[PDB]
């Protein structure tokens, strides 16, 4: 019961970290970020430590999560993931298809905190479930 929850929760958090990574790389280069079709595809084994062609990929909890989202059509934008269901962290609604870099009150920065605020409770649960096994 507990052990299985930790596995799914951790996979979901992993997808969030992949997203944070993309955003951070955008903030570093002073670039905007697209989270629609012109952004990355999150259905990519290499993003989660799998070699292309590794049959283990389709059995991963990462793939199980992504491939069962309402917004999944063989592929998944960052927006599809954030706004898709079912996941433990619910759905982020009303997102823009892209966030441009600005010098004042950077949209990419506000997007970053929107995402991290959403993943924080997930991370807390993972820490806390991990914390009652050692």
């Amino acid at each position, epitope marked *: 019961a507990l052990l299985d929850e930790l596995k799914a929760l951790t996979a979901e958090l992993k997808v969030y970290s992949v997203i944070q990574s993309q955003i951070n790389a955008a903030l570093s280069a002073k670039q905007g970020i697209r989270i*629609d079709a012109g952004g990355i595809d999150l259905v990519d084994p290499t993003l989660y430590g799998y070699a292309v062609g590794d049959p283990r990929w389709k059995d991963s909890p990462e793939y199980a999560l992504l491939s069962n989202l*309402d*917004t*999944f*059509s*063989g*592929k998944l934008s960052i927006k599809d993931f954030l*706004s898709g269901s079912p996941k433990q962290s619910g759905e982020l609604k009303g997102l823009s298809d892209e966030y441009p870099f600005e010098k004042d009150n950077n949209p990419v920065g506000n997007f970053a905190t929107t995402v991290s605020d959403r993943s924080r409770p997930l991370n807390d649960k993972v820490n806390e479930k991990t914390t009652l096994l050692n």
Partner: antibody
Amino acid sequence: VQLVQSGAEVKKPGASVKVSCKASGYSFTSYWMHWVRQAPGQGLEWMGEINPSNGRTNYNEKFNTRVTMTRDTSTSTVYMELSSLRSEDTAVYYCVLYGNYVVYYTMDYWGQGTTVTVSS
Amino acid sequence: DIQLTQSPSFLSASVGDRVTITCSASTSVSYMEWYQQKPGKAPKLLIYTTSKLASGVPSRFSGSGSGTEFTLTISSLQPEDFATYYCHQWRNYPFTFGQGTKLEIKR
């Protein structure tokens, strides 16, 4: 949203056809565009898809060596070209905006269709 | 490929009848979509994500199911519902359609 396709065509076997689909009313480069066809008296078949932001495509293996999808972002138009035509390719061809778009907006959109007739 | 097999292929009913059309997939799929089609017209989306109603579609239509078995139900058929219905999955390449269910009026 409107998807406006080019007019009906007639082709000889071995030739190729190029159908256009002009898109409006949504962020063109934000969603994949699909093609679906339907032969007379028959059902529907998905042909493939193209990502208009980057020109990436995925085709139904059945058409993979004969079909070419391209787009022009400046004019919000997608093209489907089908080569080495045979009579079995006689069909109505539709460009379609669906998939994840429907989750966001609660509807999909299809072009009016283009009839292509292949015959000697 | 995921093959979608609809049953029945042909169905007769009367205005006012409640009817159910089934779509069986050859392997499990996360969601099903449903289309209506009339002669000389493009397919019309009715139900998406298995059970959601497309904008403006009458509450007469509903969808359900999971795994390999999905259903489209019309409660109290109106004259305009006699048409061909297709299920469709866009989750697994290549995207595939059912062979269609044609609904005619009893007489």
